[PDB]
Design a protein around this ligand. Structure first.
Ligand SMILES: CCCCCCCCCCCCCCCCCC(=O)OC[C@H](COP(=O)([O-])OCC(O)COP(=O)([O-])OC[C@@H](COC(=O)CCCCCCCCCCCCCCCCC)OC(=O)CCCCCCCCCCCCCCCCC)OC(=O)CCCCCCCCCCCCCCCCC
Ligand SMILES: CCCCCCCCCCCCCCCCCC(=O)OC[C@H](COP(=O)([O-])OCC[N+](C)(C)C)OC(=O)CCCCCCCCCCCCCCCCC
Ligand SMILES: CCCCCCCCCCCCCCCCCC(=O)OC[C@H](COP(=O)([O-])OCC[N+](C)(C)C)OC(=O)CCCCCCCCCCCCCCCCC
Ligand SMILES: CCCCCCCCCCCCCCCCCCCC(=O)O[C@H](COC(=O)CCCCCCCCCCCCCC)COP(=O)(O)OCCN
Ligand code: HEM
Ligand code: HEM
Ligand SMILES: CCCCCCCCCCCCCC(=O)OC[C@H](COP(=O)([O-])O)OC(=O)CCCCCCCCCCCCC
Ligand SMILES: CCCCCC[C@H]1C(=O)O[C@H](C)[C@H](NC(=O)c2cccc(NC=O)c2O)C(=O)O[C@@H](C)[C@@H]1OC(=O)CC(C)C
Ligand SMILES: CCCCCCCCCCCCO[C@@H]1O[C@H](CO)[C@@H](O[C@H]2O[C@H](CO)[C@@H](O)[C@H](O)[C@H]2O)[C@H](O)[C@H]1O
Ligand SMILES: CCCCCCCCCCCCO[C@@H]1O[C@H](CO)[C@@H](O[C@H]2O[C@H](CO)[C@@H](O)[C@H](O)[C@H]2O)[C@H](O)[C@H]1O
Lengths: 438, 124, 54, 75, 63, 383
């Protein structure tokens, strides 16, 4: 039984949430923001990502060089990432270096220079990032998957944004973005590891007290996405490995089917030929794939957003003449979530998840990420007891009912990259989303 | 029938004193009249091989055993087409009729059968 | 629409059963409808129309 | 402390078990109906089908009770 | 033109209610009607055609 | 690359008749397949020629066959060849099936060619049954009457089905004309299924008399098996010659030289010899429907050999007890054939029932028991 997550508020509406661990000597503190690329329009798409670069380019007090020195002197590091709905800025340090790190974070968020000289310098760095993500095949596949599934909608935009916007982002629009979105009621200061809650709340009162509140304070994790069945093919015969993602519209964070979708995802599970245990996994798809050498790997996912999600699978394969078999058998395993799953598969997957959801949290950064994600998507940290109860309530009837409305005979979003000549047209893939025998 | 079944049933018989006393002499006569040794075969050379399990067990044979089995099949095929029997050293002596393949196929089948059982496990 | 889909369409067994039952009903009703229409456009001409005289 | 995982093997044959098959029982039912309706529809023209089955159905059954007038029948 | 993340324009073709049961049901109504007429047409065809094998009028006349 | 391999059409022929890799140790019982191809070619050639001179109308049918015998140049030969080759077709098919059962040709991985083979055998029976009716002699008519009345046993619809098959209320002209059309067709269907069973076989290749793999030692189909097949082609032609030229009516029934007469019933109505065992099985069951089911089951039960044979070894070459059982099974099948043409009299009635029980118990009891025990004997005996 893990220590309780303590939670306090400030007057502006900033949440402070902490989980102490007197067994470790380091602490991760940071700011989880309920804002990301989704909050941009088509004209300033890329702003959120751009700001993340400029946040470390110098403040009203410390210059870029001074900033570097300050963090180096603390001894730990700083890290940041921007997604579609969430921005994070955190600092891993020693126990007694926590007040320094909170001070640095408050400074880069509230009092960043955004000087025209630095904007112009980063404009080239970010331009180069456009031509180097091309190598990260999984990211390419998932960015195209969002682009097609949420065609011409805010969730369909990339985080980097288009080349055109990168050349036209001004300090004005940067300042406007962070003034509108980085408000206290959308921010959570999170501490995990060697932190005292009462100390963290004092530091928050010292550094984050002059944060603007938004005009209309909605609860944390408050959002209409219209999924498009569609495909993107990025054929490249020179690549040896095909990368394929297939997804349907999934579930949001607060869906009533949230846990049912996770259990269904665990029944299919993951596979990797490089891991020794993977040939012995219980998953039917895993057995088909390993026995027939159909793939190098597959990973089931159930990605959630505030008002929608994507549920599906990501496959990698060198077997270019049996891509048809791989996709065929994958979708036939999905069909069985509607037609055949019983207490056998469901209880097994629940057993695996009950542990998995706790296992994931194995260091201070993981714990801080968990607190921050849950507070910014649900508005609370869900205790392991509540999670154990919600998982226990998932029955085989629930999985079958969920699959029959979410998977069975539904439109998919499909992305293929690489030697995908063997991937059949949309209709033949989508026809595998039902069984004529049932 | 699975090799596993045959081996286990045989072991039940060999345990029972009465049963072994009556079955072992019959089995030895059977093998003499079977006459596979007169084509230079070992008993295991006759087992049906066109199954996934058997193809796996044959791939696991040590290379030497595998090369010798190939030769015995080719040699028996040549006796068969000529309507001749082995003579001299080509005849398999009872002491040479070793179960070289049985351990490999029993391991293949043990895994296959455990996989089937475990595919049907119910969390209690 | 959900209800209808779920009952008659979702399972192919049910979809095929519904198509075959519909084919049966169509076949019987179409027969009767054509028979009546054919008799009206060819009224007074058929044996059934003059039979009563004989 | 838990020493061993807690599970049993359910009876199975040719890779079928009772939990799975039981999910498909209603589907066999509907297929059986489909095959029944289909078969009956195929022999609806057979006079015995009409005499023995179809004409006995209440209300609907009079669809299949049709007499040729003796004046119009050479046989 | 260059970015492959900017999906080409599909607005001339996209239905707004594409994810609804009503949308799917309509297309299955067309498929179903077609299956229905094909079943009724097959039955008519088979029955009329195979009846050639039943006693012909001249055989029934001599009965 | 050689043209025979490069050109897709030539390559298909090449794959079956020339480069086809065969075991090097096939014995003469592997010659029946090409003899069956020869019977089929003779039946097509003679049958299409008879169709040019035969008239299917009941008023002319029997006389058209006499016209063939008497007036058509070599008509006697073409008719006798067709009639005798029908018998040879069944001798070859029983030999071929006997080889397949003895050598375990039905075992995995050859279940599919064996199962298509069972359908070929059923199609041969129907083909020959309809062809025999076409003569429209006494046995033609009365055999059609009794065999088609077996369908009356089908519950509820049986009588209706019979009238539908006949095209009337007894076997007559409508029946004869439809049997002609179907007799012409069925051999083409049979040729397709024969080809299908060879395509299915081509995945595993021929089995061989030792029951082991031949992947270690293959021979091209040509010239080795081409020239081996010629020997039995000429042996067959010698047998054919002795029947067709010297004893053309030995295998036939004299009553089929009397024109069909619905009034007079022949002394004994028996099927052609090759159907006799199935007829004895039918007689054994007192119930009409029972008898029909048993008779059909006697053929369909061949489909379960892949299941009831529990042996870990393919075929009987090395199995003394299986060989003895097979010998009893074969001789019982011949005795059933003889009992199919005796009168329904003591003591042949009870004998036919015992032989029928033995026929079915081979599949259902004896082969599963014997094959189980031999597995144990091989293992213990060689320890
Ligand atoms: C009809 C159309 C005409 C065409 C004729 C084709 C028939 C050819 C054929 O398949 O049989 C020939 C065939 C010779 O074929 P083979 O390829 O030399 O040997 C096949 C046997 O597996 C080899 O069997 P084996 O080597 O153990 O030799 C056994 C055989 C001896 O076979 C010899 O030829 C000697 O003798 C007997 O079994 C006789 C039984 C004793 C009775 C007394 O004759 C037999 O062996 C018949 C045995 C059946 C009982
Ligand atoms: C010639 C005779 C035609 C018989 C068709 C009669 C009914 C079959 C039919 O319409 O097929 C629909 C069905 C289903 O069409 P489908 O494949 O478009 O629908 C599958 C998806 N669900 C079940 C969700 C609707 O097709 C078949 O089952 C194939 C048989 C056709 C022959
Ligand atoms: C009549 C009874 C026949 C019994 C046969 C027993 C085996 C035997 O001696 O045959 C010689 C041979 C023995 O051949 P073999 O292949 O077992 O042995 C060859 C020699 N050794 C053992 C050294 C490798 O058997 C055959 O060739 C059998 C073919 C069977 C064909 C049966 C036709 C009957 C048709 C009825 C269909 C239903
Ligand atoms: C009466 C009809 C049969 C007689 C025809 C046989 C060929 C006559 C002599 C010709 C001959 O021996 O030469 C070979 C031709 O045989 C061939 O090319 C054919 C070999 C055997 C002929 C038919 C094969 C039968 C196999 C299946 C029977 C099917 C029955 C179904 C109807 C070629 O000699 P080589 O090619 O060995 O090389 C040698 C170097 N050129
Ligand atoms: C598997 C192939 C065939 C078999 C087993 C077969 C068998 C028979 C038999 C047993 C008869 C009775 C023969 C008699 O006693 O007179 C017959 C007659 C006949 N068959 Fe076939 N037949 C075959 C193929 C064909 C084909 C392809 C034709 C093409 C039309 C055909 C045309 C005839 C005709 C016209 C007769 C009647 C004349 C007669 O009796 O000889 N047959 N057939
Ligand atoms: C028109 C009738 C048929 C023809 C022309 C035919 C032809 C052939 C040929 C050419 C072969 C390969 C050579 C050989 O083994 O003899 C073969 C093999 C085979 N046939 Fe047939 N066949 C016929 C009927 C049947 C029937 C009725 C069955 C089974 C009930 C059957 C089952 C098989 C099997 C299992 C094989 C593989 C045997 C082996 O090599 O071990 N066939 N057939
Ligand atoms: C009229 C047309 C008839 C079409 C009939 C199709 C019936 C198919 C039924 C079927 O596939 O059942 C599968 C079920 C076992 O499920 P699983 O192990 O394949 O998931 O199998 C069993 O439960 C046994
Ligand atoms: C011209 C290309 C057409 C391809 C098929 C033609 C025929 C064909 O494949 O021939 C081969 C010569 C085959 N014999 C064998 O496999 C064979 C194999 C092993 C040993 C022996 N003999 C041993 O001592 C063999 O004889 C054979 O007789 O089968 C006929 C039935 C086929 O006819 C058809 O299915 C089509 C139709 C005419 C029935
Ligand atoms: C696997 C398929 C199952 C078996 C197939 C069944 C084969 C034969 C079935 C019925 C054939 C005769 O069935 C009979 O057919 C004819 C049409 O064909 C119908 O006759 C009907 O239509 C015809 C013209 O279409 C009119 O001339 C007639 O006045 C009218 O009654 C009879 O109402 C029906 O009783
Ligand atoms: C009278 C019959 C009418 C004409 C039919 C001709 C014979 C039947 C052929 C149809 C079967 C073709 O089906 C397929 O063909 C190819 C092309 O040769 C063959 O392929 C086979 O031979 C080729 C080379 O000879 C090999 O590379 C291959 O590994 C092997 O499978 C096989 O036979 C079968 O896999």
């Amino acid at each position: 039984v893990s220590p309780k997550t303590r939670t306090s508020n400030l007057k502006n509406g900033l949440t402070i949430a902490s989980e102490s661990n007197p067994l470790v000597q380091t602490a991760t503190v940071g700011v989880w923001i309920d804002a990301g690329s989704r909050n941009e329009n088509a004209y300033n798409n890329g702003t959120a990502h751009f700001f993340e670069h400029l946040a470390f380019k110098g403040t009203d007090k410390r210059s870029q060089h001074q900033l570097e020195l300050d963090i180096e002197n603390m001894g730990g590091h700083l890290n940041a990432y921007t997604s579609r709905e969430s921005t994070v800025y955190y600092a891993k340090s020693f126990k007694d270096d926590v007040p320094k790190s909170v001070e640095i974070l408050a400074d880069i968020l509230q009092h960043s220079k955004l000087a025209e000289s630095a904007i112009d310098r980063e404009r080239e760095v970010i331009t180069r990032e456009l031509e180097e993500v091309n190598k990260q095949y999984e990211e390419v596949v998932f960015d195209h998957l969002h682009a097609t599934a949420f065609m011409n909608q805010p969730l369909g935009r990339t985080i980097l944004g288009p080349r055109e916007n990168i050349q036209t982002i001004t300090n004005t629009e940067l300042r406007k973005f962070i003034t509108e979105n980085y408000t206290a009621d959308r921010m959570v200061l999170v501490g995990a590891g060697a932190v005292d809650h009462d100390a963290l709340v004092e530091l928050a009162e010292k550094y984050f007290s002059h944060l603007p509140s938004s005009q209309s304070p909605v609860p944390l994790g408050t959002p209409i996405p219209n999924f498009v069945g569609s495909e993107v093919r990025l054929r490249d015969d020179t690549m040896p490995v095909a990368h394929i993602a297939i997804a349907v519209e999934g579930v949001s964070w607060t869906s009533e089917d949230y846990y049912t979708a996770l259990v269904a995802q665990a029944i299919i599970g993951n596979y990797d030929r490089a891991v020794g245990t993977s040939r012995h996994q219980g998953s039917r798809l895993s057995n088909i794939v390993s026995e027939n050498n159909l793939a190098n790997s597959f990973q089931s996912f159930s990605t959630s957003y505030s008002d929608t999600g994507l549920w599906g699978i990501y496959l990698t394969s060198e077997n270019t003449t049996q891509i048809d078999d791989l996709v065929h058998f994958t979708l036939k395993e999905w069909n069985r979530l509607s037609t055949s799953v019983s207490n056998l598969q469901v209880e097994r997957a629940k057993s695996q998840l009950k542990a998995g959801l706790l296992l994931s949290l194995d260091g201070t950064t993981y714990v801080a990420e968990d607190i921050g994600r849950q507070l910014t998507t649900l508005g609370r940290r869900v205790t392991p007891a509540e999670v154990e109860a919600k998982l226990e309530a998932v029955t085989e009837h629930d999985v079958r009912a969920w699959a029959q409305k979410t998977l069975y005979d539904k439109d998919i979003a499909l992305v293929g990259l690489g030697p995908i000549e063997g991937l059949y047209d949309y209709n033949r893939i989508r026809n595998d989303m039902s069984m004529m025998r049932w | 029938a699975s090799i596993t079944s045959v081996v286990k049933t045989s072991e039940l018989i060999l345990k029972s004193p009465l049963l072994s006393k009556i079955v072992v002499p019959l089995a030895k006569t059977y093998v003499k009249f079977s006459g596979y040794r007169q084509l230079g075969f070992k008993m295991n050379d006759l087992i049906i091989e066109e199954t996934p399990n058997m193809q796996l067990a044959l791939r696991r044979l040590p290379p030497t055993e595998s090369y010798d089995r190939v030769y015995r099949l080719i040699r028996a095929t040549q006796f068969s087409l000529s309507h001749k029997l082995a003579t001299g050293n080509d005849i398999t002596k009872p002491e040479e009729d070793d179960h070289y393949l049985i351990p490999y196929i029993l391991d293949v089948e043990a895994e296959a059968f455990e996989k089937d059982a475990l595919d049907n496990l119910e969390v209690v | 629409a959900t209800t209808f889909y779920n009952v008659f369409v979702k399972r192919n067994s049910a979809f095929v059963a519904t198509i075959l039952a519909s084919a049966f009903v169509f076949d019987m009703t179409f027969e009767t409808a054509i028979d009546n229409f054919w008799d009206r456009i060819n009224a007074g001409k058929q044996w059934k129309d003059i039979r009563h005289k004989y | 402390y838990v020493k061993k995982p807690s599970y049993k093997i359910v009876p199975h044959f040719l890779g079928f078990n009772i939990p799975t098959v039981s999910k498909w029982i209603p589907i066999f039912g509907i297929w059986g109906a489909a095959a029944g309706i289909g078969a009956l529809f195929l022999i609806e023209g057979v006079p015995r089908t009409r005499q023995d089955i179809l004409s006995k159905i209440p209300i609907i059954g009079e669809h299949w009770i049709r007499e040729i007038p003796a004046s119009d029948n050479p046989f | 033109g260059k970015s492959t993340y900017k999906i080409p324009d599909f607005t001339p073709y996209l239905k707004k209610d594409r994810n609804t049961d009503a949308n799917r049901l309509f297309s299955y109504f067309m498929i179903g009607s077609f299956g229905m007429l094909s079943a009724a047409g097959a039955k008519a065809t088979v029955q009329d055609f195979l009846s050639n094998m039943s006693a012909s009028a001249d055989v029934l006349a001599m009965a | 690359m050689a043209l025979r391999k490069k050109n897709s059409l030539l390559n298909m022929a090449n794959s079956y008749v020339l480069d086809s890799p065969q075991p090097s140790n096939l014995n003469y019982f592997w010659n029946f397949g090409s003899l069956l191809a020869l019977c089929l070619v003779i039946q097509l050639a003679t049958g299409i020629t008879l169709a040019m001179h035969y008239t299917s109308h009941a008023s002319l049918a029997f006389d058209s066959v006499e016209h063939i015998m008497r007036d058509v140049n070599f008509g006697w030969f073409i008719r006798y060849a067709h009639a005798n080759t029908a018998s040879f077709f069944f001798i070859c098919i029983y030999a071929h099936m006997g080889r397949n059962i003895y050598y375990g040709s039905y075992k995995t991985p050859r279940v599919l060619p064996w199962s298509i083979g069972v359908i070929i055998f059923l199609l041969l029976i129907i083909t020959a049954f309809m062809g025999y009716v076409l003569v429209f002699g006494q046995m033609s008519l009365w055999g059609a009457t009794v065999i088609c009345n077996l369908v009356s046993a089908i519950p509820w619809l049986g009588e209706d089905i019979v009238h539908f098959l006949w095209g009337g209320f007894s076997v007559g002209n409508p029946t004869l004309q439809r049997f002609f059309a179907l007799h012409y067709l069925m051999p083409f269907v049979l040729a397709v299924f024969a080809l299908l069973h060879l395509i299915a076989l081509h995945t595993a290749g021929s089995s061989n008399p030792l029951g082991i793999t031949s992947n270690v030692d293959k021979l091209s189909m040509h010239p080795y098996y081409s020239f081996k097949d010629l020997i039995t082609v000429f042996a067959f032609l010698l047998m054919f010659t002795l029947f067709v030229f010297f004893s053309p009516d030995k295998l036939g029934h004299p009553d089929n030289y009397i024109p069909a007469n619905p009034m007079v019933t022949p002394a004994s109505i028996v099927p052609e010899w090759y159907l006799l065992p199935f007829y004895a099985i039918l007689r054994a069951i007192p119930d009409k429907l029972g008898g029909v089911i048993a008779m059909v089951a006697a053929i369909l039960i061949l489909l379960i050999l892949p299941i009831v044979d529990r042996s870990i070894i393919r075929g009987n070459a090395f199995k003394p007890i299986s060989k003895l059982l097979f010998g009893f099974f074969i001789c019982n099948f011949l005795l059933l054939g003889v009992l199919g043409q005796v009168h329904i009299e003591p003591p042949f009635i009870v004998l036919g029932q015992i032989c029928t029980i033995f026929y079915f118990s081979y599949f259902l009891i004896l082969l599963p028991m014997v094959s189980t025990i031999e597995n144990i004997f091989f293992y213990i005996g060689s320890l």
